[PDB]
Amino acid sequence: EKIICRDVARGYENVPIPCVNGVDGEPCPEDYKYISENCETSTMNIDRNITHLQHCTCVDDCSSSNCLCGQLSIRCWYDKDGRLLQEFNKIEPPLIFECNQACSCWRNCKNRVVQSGIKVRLQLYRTAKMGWGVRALQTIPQGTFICEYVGELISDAEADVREDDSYLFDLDNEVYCIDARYYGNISRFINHLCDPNIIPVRVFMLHQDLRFPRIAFFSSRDIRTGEELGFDYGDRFWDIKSKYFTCQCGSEKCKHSAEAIALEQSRLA
Ligand SMILES: COc1cc2nc(N(C)C3CCCC3)nc(NC3CCN(C)CC3)c2cc1OC
Ligand SMILES: C[S@@+](CC[C@H](N)C(=O)[O-])C[C@H]1O[C@@H](n2cnc3c(N)ncnc32)[C@H](O)[C@@H]1O
Ligand SMILES: [Zn+2]
Ligand SMILES: [Zn+2]
Ligand SMILES: [Zn+2]
Ligand SMILES: [Zn+2]
């Protein structure tokens, strides 16, 4: 309905991300700090040694199969328009290694999609049943980079004592987490869908410290204007939270609704 905030990102993204609410009286969320890149709250010592970067020697646009950075990702998974290859493994995505400051290529090469930031028009809006959510203000073709899951990098030991685990993304590999509860970007508002339309992909850009992949959401199908974005939060989230609330995604594939939980519980016998 009417726009309550012109840009929740305070100008830190390539495009503004407005907030609207046509459902209830809740004002624009303001109990967190918007950040556009991951932050640290303890000593993490991400390995930023430029000599530890694997890098390419391309003098073209890194569209050839001899791009070392593409080879690290098995092959460069970006097409000429920056979208994931149509054979990209969406079920089990590979690690993507983008070009970096040690590569001989130019900053506009074809292997720098995620580091170039948000390009699609997104909107923070009030959903009917799931609080705030994020939807597209444009058609988004399948394979398009949407946004990064940005927040506070924390150790697994720190995550184990975090009281609010509603905004946690496990990185896995000596395992770390992104906590977007107190510091986060637009992705902290993306809800869970049992029939998701975006997938998280682990990406390396300016560093290649394998403890800290950056989490990039790409569309898993064509997305229509106005459609809510959502990914599969996974079973660790729902094993913990189903006791407190159930899924409202409304899909016929929904496996975390009260009915879905009760039906598997009845089948139990
Ligand atoms: C994706 O979603 C989640 C991920 C969660 N991940 C963790 N850890 C500890 C990571 C650390 C590395 C591997 C496992 N903990 C959670 N919760 C713990 C439960 C016990 N309390 C006292 C502390 C918080 C999580 C909850 C999630 O969603 C509800
Ligand atoms: C990362 S947040 C998403 C943004 C949240 N809706 C908000 O208003 O800030 C996760 C929380 O959103 C709600 N949520 C997300 N997906 C949901 C779903 N499929 N069904 C019910 N609640 C959901 C739950 O409260 C969940 O703990
Ligand atoms: Zn290259
Ligand atoms: Zn390169
Ligand atoms: Zn390059
Ligand atoms: Zn569901």
CSV table of C-alpha atoms and ligand atoms in Angstrom, one decimal:
chain,number,residue,atom,x,y,z
A,1,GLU,CA,0.0,0.0,0.0
A,2,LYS,CA,1.8,3.2,1.1
A,3,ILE,CA,5.6,3.4,1.5
A,4,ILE,CA,6.6,3.7,5.1
A,5,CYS,CA,10.4,3.9,4.5
A,6,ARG,CA,12.1,4.9,1.2
A,7,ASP,CA,15.3,2.8,1.8
A,8,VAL,CA,15.8,0.4,4.7
A,9,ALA,CA,19.4,0.1,3.5
A,10,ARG,CA,20.1,3.9,4.2
A,11,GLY,CA,21.8,4.1,0.7
A,12,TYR,CA,24.3,1.3,1.3
A,13,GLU,CA,23.1,-0.9,-1.7
A,14,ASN,CA,23.2,-0.1,-5.4
A,15,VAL,CA,19.4,0.4,-5.4
A,16,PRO,CA,17.0,1.5,-2.6
A,17,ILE,CA,14.9,-1.1,-0.8
A,18,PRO,CA,11.6,0.5,0.3
A,19,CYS,CA,9.3,-0.7,3.0
A,20,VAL,CA,5.5,-0.9,2.8
A,21,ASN,CA,2.8,-2.2,5.1
A,22,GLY,CA,-0.8,-2.7,3.8
A,23,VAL,CA,-1.7,-5.4,6.3
A,24,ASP,CA,-1.5,-4.1,9.9
A,25,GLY,CA,-0.3,-1.3,12.0
A,26,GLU,CA,3.3,-2.4,12.5
A,27,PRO,CA,5.9,0.3,11.8
A,28,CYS,CA,9.1,-0.2,9.8
A,29,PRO,CA,11.4,-2.6,11.7
A,30,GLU,CA,14.0,-0.7,13.6
A,31,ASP,CA,15.3,-3.3,16.2
A,32,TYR,CA,18.5,-4.2,14.2
A,33,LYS,CA,21.4,-2.4,12.5
A,34,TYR,CA,21.3,-2.6,8.7
A,35,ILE,CA,24.7,-3.5,7.4
A,36,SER,CA,25.6,-4.2,3.7
A,37,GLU,CA,28.7,-6.4,4.4
A,38,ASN,CA,29.3,-9.0,7.1
A,39,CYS,CA,30.7,-7.7,10.4
A,40,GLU,CA,32.8,-9.2,13.2
A,41,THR,CA,32.3,-8.8,16.9
A,42,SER,CA,35.3,-10.9,18.1
A,43,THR,CA,38.7,-11.9,16.8
A,44,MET,CA,38.2,-14.0,13.6
A,45,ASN,CA,41.4,-13.3,11.6
A,46,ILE,CA,39.9,-13.9,8.2
A,47,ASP,CA,42.8,-14.8,6.0
A,48,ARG,CA,43.2,-11.7,3.8
A,49,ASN,CA,46.8,-12.4,2.6
A,50,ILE,CA,46.7,-11.4,-1.1
A,51,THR,CA,49.3,-14.1,-1.9
A,52,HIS,CA,47.0,-16.8,-0.6
A,53,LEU,CA,44.4,-16.0,-3.4
A,54,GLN,CA,44.1,-18.4,-6.2
A,55,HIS,CA,43.6,-16.2,-9.2
A,56,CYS,CA,43.5,-16.2,-13.0
A,57,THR,CA,45.8,-14.8,-15.7
A,58,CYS,CA,43.1,-13.9,-18.2
A,59,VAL,CA,43.5,-10.8,-20.3
A,60,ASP,CA,40.0,-11.2,-21.8
A,61,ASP,CA,36.6,-10.9,-20.0
A,62,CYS,CA,37.1,-14.3,-18.3
A,63,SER,CA,34.5,-16.0,-20.5
A,64,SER,CA,36.9,-18.7,-21.7
A,65,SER,CA,37.2,-22.2,-20.1
A,66,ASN,CA,40.8,-21.5,-19.3
A,67,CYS,CA,39.9,-19.0,-16.5
A,68,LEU,CA,41.5,-20.6,-13.5
A,69,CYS,CA,38.8,-19.0,-11.3
A,70,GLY,CA,36.1,-20.7,-13.4
A,71,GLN,CA,38.0,-23.9,-13.1
A,72,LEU,CA,38.1,-23.7,-9.3
A,73,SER,CA,34.2,-23.6,-9.5
A,74,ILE,CA,34.5,-26.7,-11.8
A,75,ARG,CA,33.5,-24.2,-14.5
A,76,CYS,CA,32.3,-20.6,-14.4
A,77,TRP,CA,28.6,-20.9,-13.7
A,78,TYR,CA,27.7,-17.4,-15.0
A,79,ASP,CA,26.4,-16.9,-18.5
A,80,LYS,CA,27.1,-13.7,-20.5
A,81,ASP,CA,24.3,-11.9,-18.5
A,82,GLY,CA,25.6,-12.9,-15.1
A,83,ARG,CA,23.0,-15.7,-14.5
A,84,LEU,CA,23.8,-19.2,-13.3
A,85,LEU,CA,24.1,-21.8,-15.9
A,86,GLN,CA,21.0,-23.6,-16.7
A,87,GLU,CA,22.8,-27.0,-15.7
A,88,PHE,CA,23.9,-25.4,-12.4
A,89,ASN,CA,23.4,-28.0,-9.6
A,90,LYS,CA,20.6,-26.3,-7.6
A,91,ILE,CA,20.1,-29.2,-5.3
A,92,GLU,CA,23.8,-29.4,-4.2
A,93,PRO,CA,25.5,-26.1,-5.4
A,94,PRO,CA,29.2,-26.1,-5.9
A,95,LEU,CA,31.5,-23.5,-4.3
A,96,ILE,CA,31.9,-20.4,-6.6
A,97,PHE,CA,35.3,-18.7,-6.8
A,98,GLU,CA,34.8,-15.2,-8.3
A,99,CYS,CA,37.7,-13.2,-9.6
A,100,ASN,CA,39.6,-11.0,-7.2
A,101,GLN,CA,42.2,-8.3,-6.8
A,102,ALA,CA,45.0,-10.8,-7.6
A,103,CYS,CA,43.6,-11.7,-11.0
A,104,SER,CA,45.0,-10.0,-14.0
A,105,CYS,CA,41.5,-9.4,-15.5
A,106,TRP,CA,39.5,-6.2,-15.3
A,107,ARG,CA,36.9,-5.4,-12.6
A,108,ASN,CA,34.1,-5.7,-15.3
A,109,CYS,CA,34.9,-9.3,-16.2
A,110,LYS,CA,32.2,-12.0,-16.4
A,111,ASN,CA,33.2,-13.7,-13.1
A,112,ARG,CA,32.2,-11.0,-10.6
A,113,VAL,CA,28.4,-11.2,-10.2
A,114,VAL,CA,28.0,-11.4,-6.4
A,115,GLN,CA,30.7,-8.8,-5.6
A,116,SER,CA,28.9,-6.3,-7.8
A,117,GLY,CA,25.9,-6.3,-5.4
A,118,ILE,CA,22.2,-6.0,-5.7
A,119,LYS,CA,20.7,-5.2,-9.1
A,120,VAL,CA,17.0,-6.3,-8.8
A,121,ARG,CA,14.3,-4.2,-7.2
A,122,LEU,CA,13.2,-5.7,-3.9
A,123,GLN,CA,10.7,-4.5,-1.4
A,124,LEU,CA,10.3,-5.1,2.4
A,125,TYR,CA,6.6,-5.7,3.0
A,126,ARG,CA,4.1,-6.9,5.6
A,127,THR,CA,2.9,-10.4,4.9
A,128,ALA,CA,-0.5,-11.8,5.9
A,129,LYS,CA,0.8,-14.4,8.3
A,130,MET,CA,4.6,-14.4,8.5
A,131,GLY,CA,5.5,-10.9,9.7
A,132,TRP,CA,7.8,-9.0,7.4
A,133,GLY,CA,8.9,-10.5,4.1
A,134,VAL,CA,10.7,-9.6,0.9
A,135,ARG,CA,9.2,-9.6,-2.6
A,136,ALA,CA,10.3,-8.8,-6.1
A,137,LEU,CA,9.2,-5.6,-7.8
A,138,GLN,CA,10.2,-7.0,-11.2
A,139,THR,CA,10.3,-10.2,-13.1
A,140,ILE,CA,13.5,-12.1,-12.2
A,141,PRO,CA,14.8,-14.8,-14.6
A,142,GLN,CA,16.0,-18.0,-13.2
A,143,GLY,CA,19.6,-18.0,-12.1
A,144,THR,CA,19.7,-14.3,-11.2
A,145,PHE,CA,21.7,-13.1,-8.2
A,146,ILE,CA,19.3,-11.6,-5.7
A,147,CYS,CA,21.1,-10.6,-2.6
A,148,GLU,CA,23.6,-11.9,0.0
A,149,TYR,CA,22.9,-13.3,3.4
A,150,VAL,CA,24.7,-10.6,5.5
A,151,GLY,CA,25.2,-10.5,9.2
A,152,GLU,CA,27.5,-11.0,12.2
A,153,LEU,CA,30.1,-13.7,11.8
A,154,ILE,CA,30.1,-15.9,15.0
A,155,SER,CA,31.7,-19.1,16.1
A,156,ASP,CA,29.7,-22.3,16.6
A,157,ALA,CA,30.4,-22.0,20.3
A,158,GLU,CA,29.0,-18.5,20.3
A,159,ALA,CA,25.9,-19.6,18.4
A,160,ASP,CA,25.4,-22.3,21.0
A,161,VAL,CA,24.7,-19.6,23.7
A,162,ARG,CA,22.8,-17.2,21.5
A,163,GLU,CA,19.3,-16.8,22.9
A,164,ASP,CA,17.6,-15.6,19.7
A,165,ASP,CA,18.3,-18.1,16.9
A,166,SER,CA,15.6,-16.9,14.5
A,167,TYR,CA,18.2,-15.2,12.2
A,168,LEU,CA,21.0,-17.8,12.0
A,169,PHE,CA,22.6,-19.3,8.9
A,170,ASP,CA,25.1,-22.1,9.4
A,171,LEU,CA,28.2,-22.0,7.2
A,172,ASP,CA,29.7,-25.5,7.9
A,173,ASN,CA,32.8,-27.2,6.6
A,174,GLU,CA,35.7,-25.4,12.9
A,175,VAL,CA,32.2,-24.3,11.9
A,176,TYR,CA,30.9,-20.8,11.8
A,177,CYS,CA,27.5,-19.0,11.5
A,178,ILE,CA,26.1,-15.7,10.2
A,179,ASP,CA,23.8,-14.2,12.9
A,180,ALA,CA,21.5,-11.5,11.3
A,181,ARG,CA,19.5,-10.8,14.5
A,182,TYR,CA,21.4,-7.7,15.6
A,183,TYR,CA,23.3,-6.8,12.4
A,184,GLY,CA,21.9,-7.8,9.0
A,185,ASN,CA,20.9,-6.8,5.5
A,186,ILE,CA,17.6,-7.3,3.6
A,187,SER,CA,18.1,-11.1,3.6
A,188,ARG,CA,17.2,-11.2,7.3
A,189,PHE,CA,13.6,-10.5,6.3
A,190,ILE,CA,13.3,-13.4,3.8
A,191,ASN,CA,10.9,-16.0,5.0
A,192,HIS,CA,10.9,-19.8,4.7
A,193,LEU,CA,9.1,-21.4,1.8
A,194,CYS,CA,8.6,-25.2,1.5
A,195,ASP,CA,8.4,-24.5,-2.3
A,196,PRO,CA,11.3,-22.0,-2.4
A,197,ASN,CA,12.3,-19.8,-5.3
A,198,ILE,CA,15.8,-18.8,-4.3
A,199,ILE,CA,18.8,-21.0,-3.3
A,200,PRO,CA,21.9,-20.1,-1.2
A,201,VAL,CA,25.2,-20.6,-2.9
A,202,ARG,CA,28.6,-20.4,-1.1
A,203,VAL,CA,30.9,-17.8,-2.8
A,204,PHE,CA,34.4,-16.6,-2.4
A,205,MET,CA,35.5,-13.1,-3.6
A,206,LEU,CA,38.1,-10.9,-1.9
A,207,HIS,CA,39.4,-13.7,0.3
A,208,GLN,CA,39.4,-17.5,0.1
A,209,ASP,CA,39.3,-18.4,3.8
A,210,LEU,CA,37.1,-21.5,3.6
A,211,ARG,CA,35.7,-21.0,7.1
A,212,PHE,CA,33.9,-17.9,5.8
A,213,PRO,CA,32.0,-18.5,2.5
A,214,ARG,CA,29.7,-15.7,1.7
A,215,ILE,CA,26.1,-16.7,1.1
A,216,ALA,CA,24.6,-15.6,-2.2
A,217,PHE,CA,20.9,-16.1,-3.0
A,218,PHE,CA,20.1,-16.9,-6.7
A,219,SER,CA,16.6,-17.4,-8.1
A,220,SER,CA,15.9,-21.1,-8.7
A,221,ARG,CA,13.2,-20.4,-11.2
A,222,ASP,CA,11.6,-17.4,-13.0
A,223,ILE,CA,10.1,-15.1,-10.4
A,224,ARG,CA,7.1,-13.0,-11.2
A,225,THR,CA,6.6,-9.4,-10.1
A,226,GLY,CA,5.1,-9.1,-6.6
A,227,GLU,CA,6.1,-12.7,-5.7
A,228,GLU,CA,7.5,-13.2,-2.2
A,229,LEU,CA,11.1,-14.5,-2.1
A,230,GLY,CA,11.8,-17.5,0.1
A,231,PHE,CA,14.4,-20.2,0.7
A,232,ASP,CA,14.4,-23.5,2.6
A,233,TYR,CA,15.6,-22.8,6.1
A,234,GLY,CA,16.4,-26.5,6.5
A,235,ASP,CA,15.6,-29.1,9.1
A,236,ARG,CA,17.8,-27.8,11.9
A,237,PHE,CA,15.7,-24.6,12.0
A,238,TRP,CA,12.4,-26.5,12.0
A,239,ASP,CA,13.5,-29.2,14.4
A,240,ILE,CA,14.0,-26.3,16.9
A,241,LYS,CA,11.1,-24.0,16.0
A,242,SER,CA,8.2,-26.3,15.2
A,243,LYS,CA,7.5,-26.6,18.9
A,244,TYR,CA,6.9,-22.8,19.0
A,245,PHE,CA,5.1,-22.2,15.7
A,246,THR,CA,4.4,-23.9,12.4
A,247,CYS,CA,4.9,-23.1,8.8
A,248,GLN,CA,2.4,-20.8,7.1
A,249,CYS,CA,3.8,-21.0,3.5
A,250,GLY,CA,0.5,-22.5,2.4
A,251,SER,CA,2.0,-24.7,-0.3
A,252,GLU,CA,0.6,-28.1,-1.0
A,253,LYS,CA,4.2,-29.3,-0.6
A,254,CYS,CA,4.5,-27.8,2.9
A,255,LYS,CA,6.2,-30.1,5.2
A,256,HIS,CA,6.3,-28.0,8.4
A,257,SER,CA,2.6,-27.0,8.9
A,258,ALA,CA,0.7,-28.0,12.0
A,259,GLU,CA,-1.3,-30.4,9.8
A,260,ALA,CA,1.9,-31.8,8.1
A,261,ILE,CA,3.5,-32.3,11.6
A,262,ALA,CA,0.4,-34.0,13.0
A,263,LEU,CA,0.0,-36.2,10.0
A,264,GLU,CA,3.5,-37.5,10.3
A,265,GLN,CA,2.9,-37.8,14.0
A,266,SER,CA,-0.3,-39.8,13.4
A,267,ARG,CA,1.4,-42.0,10.8
A,268,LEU,CA,3.9,-42.8,13.7
A,269,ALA,CA,1.6,-45.4,15.2
B,1,LIG,C1,19.6,-22.5,10.4
B,1,LIG,O1,18.8,-22.3,11.5
B,1,LIG,C2,19.3,-22.4,12.8
B,1,LIG,C3,20.7,-22.8,12.9
B,1,LIG,C4,21.2,-22.9,14.2
B,1,LIG,N1,22.5,-23.3,14.4
B,1,LIG,C5,23.0,-23.4,15.6
B,1,LIG,N2,24.4,-23.8,15.8
B,1,LIG,C6,25.0,-24.0,17.1
B,1,LIG,C7,25.2,-24.0,14.6
B,1,LIG,C8,26.6,-23.6,14.9
B,1,LIG,C9,27.4,-24.4,13.9
B,1,LIG,C10,26.6,-25.6,13.6
B,1,LIG,C11,25.2,-25.4,14.3
B,1,LIG,N3,22.3,-23.3,16.7
B,1,LIG,C12,21.0,-23.0,16.6
B,1,LIG,N4,20.2,-22.8,17.7
B,1,LIG,C13,20.8,-23.0,19.0
B,1,LIG,C14,19.9,-23.8,19.9
B,1,LIG,C15,20.4,-23.8,21.4
B,1,LIG,N5,20.5,-22.4,21.8
B,1,LIG,C16,20.8,-22.4,23.3
B,1,LIG,C17,21.4,-21.7,21.1
B,1,LIG,C18,20.9,-21.6,19.6
B,1,LIG,C19,20.4,-22.8,15.3
B,1,LIG,C20,19.1,-22.5,15.2
B,1,LIG,C21,18.5,-22.3,13.9
B,1,LIG,O2,17.2,-22.0,13.7
B,1,LIG,C22,16.3,-22.0,14.8
B,2,LIG,C1,14.7,-14.6,9.5
B,2,LIG,S1,13.1,-14.2,10.1
B,2,LIG,C2,12.3,-13.7,8.7
B,2,LIG,C3,11.7,-12.3,8.8
B,2,LIG,C4,10.5,-12.2,9.8
B,2,LIG,N1,9.3,-12.6,9.1
B,2,LIG,C5,10.4,-10.9,10.4
B,2,LIG,O1,9.2,-10.3,10.4
B,2,LIG,O2,11.4,-10.3,10.9
B,2,LIG,C6,12.5,-15.7,10.6
B,2,LIG,C7,11.2,-15.6,11.3
B,2,LIG,O3,10.1,-15.3,10.4
B,2,LIG,C8,8.9,-16.1,10.7
B,2,LIG,N2,8.7,-17.0,9.5
B,2,LIG,C9,9.6,-17.2,8.5
B,2,LIG,N3,9.2,-18.1,7.7
B,2,LIG,C10,8.0,-18.6,8.2
B,2,LIG,C11,7.1,-19.5,7.8
B,2,LIG,N4,7.2,-20.2,6.6
B,2,LIG,N5,6.0,-19.8,8.5
B,2,LIG,C12,5.8,-19.1,9.7
B,2,LIG,N6,6.6,-18.2,10.1
B,2,LIG,C13,7.7,-17.9,9.4
B,2,LIG,C14,9.2,-16.8,12.0
B,2,LIG,O4,8.9,-16.0,13.1
B,2,LIG,C15,10.7,-17.0,11.9
B,2,LIG,O5,11.3,-17.3,13.1
B,3,ZN,ZN,39.8,-15.3,-15.6
B,4,ZN,ZN,40.1,-14.5,-11.9
B,5,ZN,ZN,38.1,-12.2,-14.2
B,6,ZN,ZN,5.5,-24.7,4.5
